[PDB]
Amino acid sequence: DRPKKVLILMSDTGGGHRASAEAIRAAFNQEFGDEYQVFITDLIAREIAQGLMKYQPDIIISVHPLMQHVPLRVLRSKGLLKKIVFTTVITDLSTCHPTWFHKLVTRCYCPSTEVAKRAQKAGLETSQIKVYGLPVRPSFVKPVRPKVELRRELGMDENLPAVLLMGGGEGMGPIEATARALADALYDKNLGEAVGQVLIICGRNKKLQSKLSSLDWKIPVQVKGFITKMEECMGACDCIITKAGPGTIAEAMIRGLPIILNGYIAGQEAGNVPYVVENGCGKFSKSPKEISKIVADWFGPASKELEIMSQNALRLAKPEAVFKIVHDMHELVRKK
Structure with missing residues (x-):
């Protein structure tokens, strides 16, 4: 259609996982090409508001536990919430903190069925929950030599x-x-x-x-x-x-x-x-x-x-987590 921009929110402090973000960026690259441009931003409201304007993302991905509430607020503060798909990739394998979950999210991607059970606990509906596993780089997933x-x-x-x-x-x-x-x-x-x-x-x-x-x-x-x-x-x-x-x-x-x-x-x-x-x-x-x-x-x-x-x-093991996630986001963005 038209090139799209993806912003993934990390923060070098406070939990969450950047390798998952990089894995996601590599998967968009491999699967779609220049149909997507993917930035990873290490950041709160003012910075978010800034990065919003710098990248004007079509889709925002959070790989951080603290990156739901403030970013969503700011998205609603700028009337962007219906334009921009907002997704979360939980990087806690189990036993997470409540902050990982937010009702205004579009989709929340779970690494286990346990985490997904926690998302249901938080009031998220079936359309908002997926369980594909925790994303790992594609280059990791190539079958390897003897x-x-x-x-x-x-x-x-x-x-x-x-x-x-x-x-x-x-x-x-x-x-x-x-x-x-x-x-x-x-x-x-x-x-x-x-x-x-x-x-x-x-x-x-x-x-x-x-x-x-x-x-x-x-x-x-x-x-x-x-x-x-x-x-x-x-x-x-x-x-x-x-x-x-x-x-x-x-x-x-x-x-x-x-x-x-x-x-x-x-x-x-x-x-x-x-x-x-x-x-x-x-x-x-x-x-x-x-x-x-x-x-x-x-x-x-x-x-x-x-x-x-x-x-x-x-x-x-779920070696195809990364592909599943990005293909799911791909169609999520498309329904617009």
């Missing part, structure tokens, strides 16, 4: 089972202690045999990255900084240790990785934990000793438990 080919490209051992350890960011138990604990649990002293291997992704924690990659490891340990392609990394491993950041969780499930939740950002990600644990996809622990035992058992005596949890994750 395990040994990924392992080799990442400098890992080809045969040992691997735990993905994420050390980036805030909220986790001791990463260095955890890696050392992992090395001890996965070494057979008499055999001189590594029982497993570790891949540590440091993200932006560079002090951790240098310390960990200067150590002498009992088992194969690969240390990295920032990784653009998480799909290759997750495809090379057999389980994952991480903070209950929602994207990382939704990614791991797509790759059938059983999760050890290493913690969470308080006030933000703690509702993600039951989504993992109560659904049979993983465990919680911050302790290095407790974590490494879990991995060591999953790589030996509880290996049946690992395979079962690995099936539970694929079953919960």
Whole structure:
């Protein structure tokens, strides 16, 4: 028809998830092309009012818990509410805050049926609620090379089972202690045999990255900084240790990785934990000793438990969330 503009509201503080926003932007790009131009704005009323005028969006998307009430008010203050489709993509996997929901919204996209039940609780009608899962980048969703080919490209051992350890960011138990604990649990002293291997992704924690990659490891340990392609990394491993950041969780499930939740950002990600644990996809622990035992058992005596949890994750996985959402927004905008 005519080119349309999309504004996605994030805020670097207060919860919510920008990787979902970027995932959404990439999905519009892939699916539709220049039929849509997509901006992500980090911001309250005056700024909203500003960004409204800067981008004059056809459709507004909120990936933030605080981005419903004020933006909607301002939309009604400027008579824009019937012109502009307003949508919410909840980035809390479970157990959310009431603010995620707003009756004046057009559509609210849920990552679980649990969250959707909460939307119904809030008075939103069936037309306003969809459950497609939590959006993940498309480039993540491409079926990936074989395990040994990924392992080799990442400098890992080809045969040992691997735990993905994420050390980036805030909220986790001791990463260095955890890696050392992992090395001890996965070494057979008499055999001189590594029982497993570790891949540590440091993200932006560079002090951790240098310390960990200067150590002498009992088992194969690969240390990295920032990784653009998480799909290759997750495809090379057999389980994952991480903070209950929602994207990382939704990614791991797509790759059938059983999760050890290493913690969470308080006030933000703690509702993600039951989504993992109560659904049979993983465990919680911050302790290095407790974590490494879990991995060591999953790589030996509880290996049946690992395979079962690995099936539970694929079953919960929704790799097509991103496409579904944007195709739904596409038709939402069109009915005008």
